[PDB]
Amino acid sequence: LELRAAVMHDILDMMPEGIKQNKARTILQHLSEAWRCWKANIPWKVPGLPTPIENMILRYVKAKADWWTNTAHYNRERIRRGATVDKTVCKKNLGRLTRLYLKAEQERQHNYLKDGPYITAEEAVAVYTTTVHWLESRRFSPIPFPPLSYKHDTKLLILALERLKEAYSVKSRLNQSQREELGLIEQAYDNPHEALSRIKRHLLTQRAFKEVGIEFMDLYSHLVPVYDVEPLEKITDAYLDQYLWYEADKRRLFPPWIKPADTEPPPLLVYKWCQGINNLQDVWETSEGECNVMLESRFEKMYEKIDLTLLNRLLRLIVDHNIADYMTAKNNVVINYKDMNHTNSYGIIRGLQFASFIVQYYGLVMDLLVLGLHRASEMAGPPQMPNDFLSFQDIATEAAHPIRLFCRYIDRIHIFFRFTADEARDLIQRYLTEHPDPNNENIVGYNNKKCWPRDARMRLMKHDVNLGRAVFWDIKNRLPRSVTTVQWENSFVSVYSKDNPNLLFNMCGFECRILPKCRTSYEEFTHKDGVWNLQNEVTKERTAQCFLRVDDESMQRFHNRVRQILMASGSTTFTKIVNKWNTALIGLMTYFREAVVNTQELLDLLVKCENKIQTRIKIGLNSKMPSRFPPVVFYTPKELGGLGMLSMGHVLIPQSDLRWSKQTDVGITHFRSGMSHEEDQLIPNLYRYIQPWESEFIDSQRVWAEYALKRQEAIAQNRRLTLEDLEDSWDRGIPRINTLFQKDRHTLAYDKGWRVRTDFKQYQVLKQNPFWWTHQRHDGKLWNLNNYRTDMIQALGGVEGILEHTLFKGTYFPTWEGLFWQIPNRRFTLWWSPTINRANVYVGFQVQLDL
Amino acid sequence: GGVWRNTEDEILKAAVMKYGKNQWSRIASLLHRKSAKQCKARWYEWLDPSIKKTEWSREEEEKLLHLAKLMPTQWRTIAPIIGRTAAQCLEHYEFLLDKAAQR
């Protein structure tokens, strides 16, 4: 209002040429339409105007743009935690940053066409020759053209349509775009040949695409865009991604150097990497001047600096010419905002359905440049006998290798570079000659973990800190700055020497600490039974210990996820607030089974959040700040009429809440449960009723070995494996064994890349789905909490004790059996009426309703 | 759906004149035959008054042939580069030029 009133004060003073029919609200409307045109980052100015009137309008618009950009950056700096309170500022800060993200992409795409920020065309011919030499050395056949009469196209179309239907349409969905999306899915399901003929004509002929809508997700820590595509082009793109992954599984075009694949995405990224680091040829021994350096870093540039010309040339080398033109043209269609309309052909769209094959294309291209052509041939091995995810051809291959292991994430990259005595002195001499530091400035800035940084962090020595700069400088100079750079602010290179016995590495889910017992390790606190005993594959003894603490980025993401459920109180039901936290806790406790027990800061976040939600749900009932709310009104399951909150914390039930009373014929038989020896806890934590990943992987090795022995006994004796033979072999193992015995077992096996497609599925969906761990189709249900509800009812006081605190005695039911059915808030508040309205729950009160 | 017919182009020209060009919901409230995304595509490709819907001369054919080698995909990026800005006739002119040079 002050900028609007001063604009009218300036326009009536800064030369109106006297009283000559001066301006009015239309001049202020001209300034209003100029700001609205700039708000969508459009080049529409206000033409056809006098020069001082336009200069006075552009001066106030440039000053208002300084105020709005400063107000956007101030709210974004307080968006991580800031205030832990946001009613309508969350939608405004996300909408203001969506305008800045669209305008910066529009100026960058316009600079790519006008100026020339290319992919360094002299070196780009070497990158096309490197992929041509690596494919010829592996002798991999290219991806064939899609057949017009493919028998495998029926299973490929059914698997892609099942993923599109289960993602969008779940429950309570209705929109103008969701109507045609569910309609085209049902029309394709009733006519598979009609959709297959339409998908064939869309690929071989239509070399363009329609507009796509970009919308940023509601992540307070770091926003991630979601690219909503056309409904007709989405079903066509899903068949291209399913056929490419099915062909890559048969042709083996994706090496195991980059493994986000659907084998075991939590354990094998951590436990098989830790067992691979321990089973190396004299890895923990470093008394002979040897040194190890684990460099963990993300590329953070292979999503927007992608060259469409190099991606099209690599697609012609990988697939047919018809599939290559359709895949490149889908990533250069349109970027339509809410009001803006940006151009394209400046990078790769990772929100499309065919982004999984494009990510694996740069994954093999960047790993070949970082490691080497002759390096990768010694790492993966010959195609006649390929290696495992962390294996080698012989012991002499890993002996003369400077890079012992190379595990590549979709965005991150891990390398356990092993150096000898002379190799470390030669590398630090090249790093000091190219980058000197006479005033000890090489140890000025250096990232370190938070896993007790007093005797377990990286020991900042002289030779150890010099090798930390040298190992990163050779990896940074190996990759060009146009394709994929490697910053230091996101990297973490923890060295290993005689001075630093503790080793640290941030894995895909959490941070890990490897410390062998023979090398005089750290204090070894071991706060719970979550220390992995990593054994050597040769000696089969206690080689090294592995600590598994939770990460700081996941703890901040859970603190933001618990803040969203706490801020959603009042505008929803009480049962919806408890069910939102139970799904958020089961996704965190199962994925961090060993980590949540061995992290004191993670348990402090759970005891604070669970006490906050029980404070939040109690205010929605009454607003008098009760003294001692009963825990039976929250921890009761939904079958017995309760909210059903998973108690991941010591919330003990008091002794005055476990007494039953009934008077049938003689008198009131006051029953009481006898557990007052030490304590009567209401419900145990979920970590006690969830198997840890060290015990799960150890039992799974005995599960499939007994399965292979019983199947060999059934094949030799010519007997049928019955359910009694698979009773004890049904638990779980590596993957849920019931997933192999499903009704759709023949169709689910022909869809490779289950973990990789589910990772980009959350990148393309609107809501942040907590399904990044695994899926129930391929992996199967692992967190079986059926034994928790039986223990929660037995510890609360039985079915008679839970019903005694309810209004079951007034309902006049002669037997406690199945009798279930602002409106759900009214039924919940009336059911626990003697529990939520008493003298102990509310102290000072004598209010009577009526007569 | 929404092929931008003669009846759809007259309703789109009325909405661009009376309602507005930047109001896809106002054009959707007067046609009831195509979506708002189809109405924005018809106002840019078919019913665009500033669209050069003819003159595929040798200067435009040589510009399309030079942009074909410089950019085989990204027809939406090569349409204002050639100056035609059609984004659908550019693939049609590339199909006709390849059919003429097929021999």
Partner: peptide, 28 residues
């Protein structure tokens, strides 16, 4: 000092030789 109304909302070469040089090198 004329004040015309303003109502429009709902209420050099574009090429570079490096792009042709990168495409011809990939074609060669």
């Amino acid at each position: 000092w004329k004040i015309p109304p303003c109502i429009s909302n709902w209420k050099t070469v574009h090429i570079n030789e490096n792009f042709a040089k990168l495409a011809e090198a990939l074609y060669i």
